[model samples]
Each structure stands twice: as structure tokens, then as C-alpha cells.
Target: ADPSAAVARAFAPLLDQYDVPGMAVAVTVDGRQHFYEFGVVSKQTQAPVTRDTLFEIGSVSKTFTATLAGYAATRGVLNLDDHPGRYLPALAGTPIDRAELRNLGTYTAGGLPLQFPESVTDDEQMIAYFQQFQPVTAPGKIRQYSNPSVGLLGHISARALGGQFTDLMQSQILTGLGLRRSFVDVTDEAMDFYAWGYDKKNHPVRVNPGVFDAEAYGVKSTTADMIRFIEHNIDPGALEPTLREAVKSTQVGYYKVGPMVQDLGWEQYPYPVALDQLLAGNSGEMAMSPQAATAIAPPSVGSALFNKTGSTDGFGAYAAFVPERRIGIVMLANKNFPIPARVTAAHTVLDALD
Candidate 1:
């Protein structure tokens, strides 16, 4: 086998060991592409998995939201430092203070409890929830991961561009990048291309019911589309230079989150892969079953990897890239298992690439 093919052969067993139902993996090095596939697409239909299969990218969608924010920042439509209420006036003069809104960018919104309230149904309810929320910690003092917080930032960016955040995101970000298969909503035909998420017990599951939360965690994409997005970020010449700069800038460290450094849209590790040098990324978790969740990890330990995972009822997915190395990987799965195993497997494959 050639070196890349050998790398693929060696990593095949890891997927089998974990009982992963279906997975589509794509690796790109210096612009050349390699693909791998394993398992089934869905337990219900008994369809074989393939390279074109789609998965719910979950919180990984945040990277896209963050990208849109960065693009807006590049256009001078918004400033990252500006409080959220500046563009989202509905948040102004309410219980949700400007300081709290600013904190949303870094997951440091002063301990506003994580997750949405039980009654939150739509955008209006979301805004009301923010207004009624009481600060649990000093604004900007602590890092508390919250979907609502990040979703709000996305909402702010969407509002800055137009009234509907998702629409603006589609037109300005996804369409601009020519990502036809990446979307907040999935279509009937696209449904056929989806992988079904399974629980720890291997039973089928559905995505979370919160549709309006698309900004925080609602997107579906294929590996091919994700790799394209990664390429655009790694090479500004591939897209508008302003957009490229924005993508690069978002990966810059914003603050320290425990041992990890928080970037605008990602997290960075301070050490390398060999030295543990500054490898940073994020992960995604979606409701697979009431008792089980699916996740994905960064592609490698070092190499400055930034990554995220996503899952819906029947699909789980992951994507990561090393900017310095100019390499990226995308893994989409139909089964829901502990995220660590998938992440570990991905890193193992990445390590073998050399």
C-alpha cells in the first residue's frame, strides 16, 4: 500500500472495536485528499455507509457561526469586543446586561446557568429567558460553557446582517463558500444521505428537538463540504482575503479556560503534539438517547489541532484541522458512543499519516 493507503488500513480496526455503525472519514494534506469508509449508514434501513453520507454536525456548527461573526467583524459590521446588546437591542435595558452579553463570546458569561430553560420555545422566549436570567457568577469572571450564550452571539451576528440569523448565515457564509450540502435544515432527499445515530446499546436515536438553537448547535454537513471549509480557512487565497483573515483571527486565543486557551470559536492547547504545543479545538455533544450521547475529538494531540463534534438523534459527526500543517480531517458516524473513543481513533489515524 502507498503511505496514505497504509495509514487507512492500520486505522480500520479501531472503528470495528468500538462497534461504530457507519463512518465517513476524509483527510487532506497539502490539498491532496484521501477518503475512508466503514460500517452501515443506518440501523433501520440497513444501508451501507459511504463517503457522501451526511451527519448532524451539532456544536461544530458553532465554528460556522463564529466564522460568520468573524466575517462581519471583517466587514466592520460588528466588533467582537462590542457588547451583544449593541446589535441585539432587545437584550439592552433588560435583566440580561451588556457585560453578560459580551461574556457570551468566551463562555464566560458569569455563570449564567448552562442550557436553555424548559419553557424556551422560540427566539422571543429565548430573549425573555436572557432577560429574566440572574447572574450566577460575576460577568466575564468565570468560563461556563452554555449553548444559549453562544447561540445569542450567532443571533447577534445574524441580526447585524439582517433580521433572520440563519438566512444571513446561509447567504453570506455557506453560499459564499459554495457549501451546498451544509445547512441548518435538512431536506427530504438529504435525509436519504444521513447517517442514523445509535445509542451505547446500539439502538436508534433522534436529534434534539430544539430547532431554533441552530446557532448554538444545529447544522448538518458532509465530510466533503467540511473539508472545503477547512481549506478556505487554511488558504486565504482560496477565498476572499478578508474572510481568510477573519477565520485566522477567530482561532487566536481569547482567554484561558483551565489548561485550554479559548479562541473566539475554538479552544487551543498550549503544548505541541510532541511537546503538547498549542493544539487547540472544540468538541460537540448532541442528545443521542436519553442515556447516551455521541461526540468527536480533535484529529491529533499536537500539531495545533482545532476541532469539534456534532450529533443528532440518528447521526454523529466530527471535523478538525491543523493550520500549521495545512491538514484537516472529517469523520461522520451514524452511531452514538462515548466521544473519547472516536476522538482517540481519529488522532491515531492522523498520527499514522506521516
Candidate 2:
């Protein structure tokens, strides 16, 4: 299918259309990797993106958060049913008292907001926000897309491991996954690999810090490393058995969000990848509505397609894979755009590879 040529042509026009300065993509098919790059790191620097270029990755970071939580599960460190307050006791007596750990990880925690209020900048304010918070839905009822829901799940999971969130994420998830370049914090020496994104207005931009930034969306990584992670998800038999099970555990379909089902962070759909399903799954209807939650360790995704979408203020990324087909694609860019573009482009590429 000439993946490099196919994906390159498919994604080119969208760059300018979305005001993206640059992007790096990785596709793995039949156990082989291919990378395609486009445009500049910054409109000002005019530096081309290379194999080492790191993109902010945003909510794609949630998948790693889920993995760490799952690893903690397998280690007998924490149970998904424990109330989040088991780790963050201050979360108790508020609306969070009605919720449990699973709901937090699954984004079905009584309609928690998508993010912390803009005014919440520190731990004290963050705790107070939750203390006074009200939920629009009851625990386990709806599938609201939220950072606080999962962010708290990450925070709780780290406490179960007896450590800070960023350290547990690095030691238990990223390092456990054998990732070298992905990080919760990019050090000064590593700045050489970092790239600046642009806003819709073409002004330079980066993600802003928030209370749960590390747990919610602080990862920065390269296409080469991301592709390797996807490859591991495709076939983890060679991984240590516990780690393999932990990674696979994140695929549990805890609820039906809409036309698609929600895993811990990934979304799943029936196989052969229907266009109607894809359309509805990524639709505004799906993004806003909440739905029913299933038990943890819910049935395996089994021959289905699983995927995730991520965006910060400036960057947008999409990842999709079919385990049965052993194919996956990762598209990371320095701009934000419509969800449909990411979905349709991924559909075209995945269908061709299939």
C-alpha cells in the first residue's frame, strides 16, 4: 500500500488547513516501522522535525496513566473499586465520596468536569475545588470526557505504590515499558529534542501547567519511541508476563460511550472499522454524552479496533490499531484541528494497511 507515500499525501494539505507548523507520524504494519515528517518545528526557527523531535502528546498521555494504574492493580497495590479518597482522603465527603477508583479511571465519575477550573493553580486550590465541586450526573452513570476524573485516578494509583505521581509514572509505566525518551518532565539537556507548536492564529504556543498536569497530560516523546510503544501493544508476549497483563488490562471496555465503547483511555469499535461507527464515535454527540459503565476486567476487545485521540492547546494527535490485524498508526502534530480530520485520515490509513 506504499504507506509512506499514502500517508504523506493524505496528511499534507491538512497541515496548512489546520495551521500546523510541523508533525511526525509513525506507522507499524506487519511488524515493520515507517516514519513520515512534514514542515517546521516553529514558524520562526524554520527547523525541520527529525527522528529526535518531541511532541507534547497531550491526552495520549492518559494511556500511560492507565497502564501505571493497571500495573499497580496487578501488583496487589490497589484495587479499582477503592474510593479515590483511599489515597486522597480529602476527596472524600464531596461528590467524590459517591465514586470509586474505577469510575475515575473510566471517566464515568459522576460527571466530573473536563478540566479543573481555570483558577485552580495549586494543590490547596485544587483540593478545595473538588471539596466544593458538584456533579451533574451520579457515579457510574455517564461517560464525560474529563481530565480530573482520570487525573485523580493517576494520583490515587501513585499513592498506592507509596510514591509521587510523576515518579511512579516514570518507574512503573514509562520505564517499565522500556521507554527512554518519553517523560513527565523534559530536562534542560533534553531541550534539544523539544519542538514548539503554533496556535490557530499561527502564534507559538505550548501546553500550560495545571494541578494534575503530570498525571493528565505532561508526556513529551518522539515518533520512534511512540511507534515502539504501539508495537509493544500490538504484541506483548515477549514482555515480562506481569507487565504484559498490565498493559492488556487497560483494554478493558468499562462502558459504552456511544457508537463506541470506552476502555480505560482507548476507545474500541467492531472490526472491519465501519465508517458510520467511526463518524458517530468521533462526533460531537459522542464527545458530550455520558453512558453506562461495565465491570472492570470487562470482556476483551477481541478482534475489534481500539484507538485514542489527544490534543493540548496547540498540538493534536491520533492513535489507532487493530490487534488482530497487527497494525497501528500514530499522528502527532504541532496544531489543533477538528476530530473528524484525525479520524478520517486514520480510517483511510488503517483500512489500507488492513
Highest lDDT against the true fold, candidate = 2
User: What is the lDDT, from 0 to 100, of the residue 213 in candidate 1?
Assistant: 67
How many angstroms is residue 132 displaced in model 1 relative to the true structure, after the best TM-score fit? 1.1
For 94-204, candidate 1 gives per-residue lDDT tens digits of 655645434676677655555787889876887778787887665656666767778888888777776587787777788788788877777787887867778777787
Candidates' lDDT values, in order? 0.67, 0.82
- Model 2 scores a TM of 0.95
- Model 1 TM-score is 0.85
Tens digits of per-residue lDDT for model 2, 124-204: 998888788787878877788889888888888888989998888877778878888888888788787788877767778
Q: State the weakest 10-residue window (summed lDDT) of model 2.
A: 293-302
Q: Which runs of model 1 end up more than 4 angstroms from their true locations?
A: 1-11, 100-102, 274-303
